[PDB]
């Protein structure tokens, strides 16, 4: 599914992004949008066999088991299709690992480059939380 | 003979940090000067990858990094030769960018994008046929996405003068997008097979256009 911008926030809302490990809400929607554009279901295969999936695009050479990346981790103990689902509660859980692995919000380059230092908040303006 | 061959290779792992490495080397060119200069850039590259994975087993823990480069030859002709290089770097998600460079066999020369072409028209020229390219595909396909006419992201105005390019066994050009440079991330390295009929008045000639 391809959620609307607004009905995201008030999604990642419910589970309790905003301000999580500091970051505001508008750092997680910015994120999704240059990982995704929103869509759930988004896959993208790369050149060292792993995967990202899903709103996030979460990878499996580190989070995530999807039984085709040799020599890969499984770090958020998932199966990789669990990513992939309209419910976004498996990617958050996953996303909440991830930024405290010890990187912050950097481990994604989406948001490095088209998020950081940016007005976040836009992501968010216009909605009703 | 003019190939590509693997010259150095780096696996290693260690704490939440590993390599995986393959560096490629040109051999074959008369002209040693250019043969040794492109081959000093790919071990700078290499080089450069190396000290990152060595920066990231150093010192704090900064997270899971996961580095890896290969290359591969996606043209070898008599007459040209190209070599793709990636470069993916993977933390939370992956980001691959992919690098092209492509020979003139016979005449010893490095291809620029500039070289191909009399004047600089052919940025505009060239952008201009991308976005078509995009709105078509998009068109088509709705799940390709590419940042457009997308209201919430800065859209894609201008290929770079020196963008990323090749050539096809088939004397076509292509243009090459890394990941997240035009479009979301989910849709990977893009690229943009530019018809000849569309620039043929630009080019200097048709020895490697056509
Ligand atoms: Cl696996
Ligand atoms: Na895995
Ligand atoms: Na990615
Ligand atoms: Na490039």
């Not at chain 1, 380059?109 to 940016?118: E, M």
């Not at chain 2, 008599?78 to 793709?84: A, G, T």
Request: glycine share 6%; net charge neutral; proline share 3%.
């Amino acid at each position: 599914k391809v959620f609307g911008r607004c009905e995201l926030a008030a999604a990642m809302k419910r589970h309790g992004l905003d301000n999580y490990r500091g970051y505001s809400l508008g750092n997680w929607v910015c994120a999704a949008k240059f990982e995704s554009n929103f869509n759930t279901q988004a896959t993208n295969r790369n050149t060292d066999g792993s995967t990202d999936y899903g709103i996030l695009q979460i990878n499996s050479r580190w989070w995530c088991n999807d039984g085709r990346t040799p020599g890969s981790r499984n770090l958020c103990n998932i199966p990789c299709s669990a990513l992939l689902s309209s419910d976004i509660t498996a990617s958050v859980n996953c996303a909440k690992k991830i930024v405290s692995d010890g990187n912050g919000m950097n481990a994604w380059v989406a948001w490095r480059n088209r998020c950081k230092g940016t007005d976040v908040q836009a992501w968010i303006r216009g909605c009703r939380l | 003979i003019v190939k590509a061959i693997t010259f150095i290779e780096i696996k290693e792992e260690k704490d939440q940090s590993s390599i995986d490495v393959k560096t490629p080397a040109l051999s074959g060119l008369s002209n040693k000067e250019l043969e040794n200069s492109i081959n000093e850039k790919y071990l700078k590259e290499s080089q450069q990858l190396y000290k990152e994975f060595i920066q990231s087993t150093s010192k704090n823990k900064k997270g899971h990094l996961s580095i890896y480069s290969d290359y591969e030859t996606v043209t070898d002709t008599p007459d040209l030769l190209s070599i793709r290089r990636n470069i993916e770097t993977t933390q939370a998600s992956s980001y691959t960018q992919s690098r092209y460079i492509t020979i003139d066999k016979k005449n010893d020369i490095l291809l620029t994008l500039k070289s191909l072409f009399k004047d600089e028209r052919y940025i505009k020229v060239i952008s201009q046929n991308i976005k078509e390219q995009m709105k078509q595909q998009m068109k088509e396909d709705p799940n390709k996405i590419y940042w457009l006419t997308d209201e919430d992201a800065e859209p894609f105005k201008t290929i770079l003068p020196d963008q990323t390019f090749y050539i096809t066994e088939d004397h076509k050009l292509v243009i090459s997008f890394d990941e997240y440079e035009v479009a979301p991330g989910y849709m990977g390295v893009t690229e943009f097979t530019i018809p000849t009929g569309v620039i043929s008045n630009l080019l200097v000639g048709e020895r490697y256009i056509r």
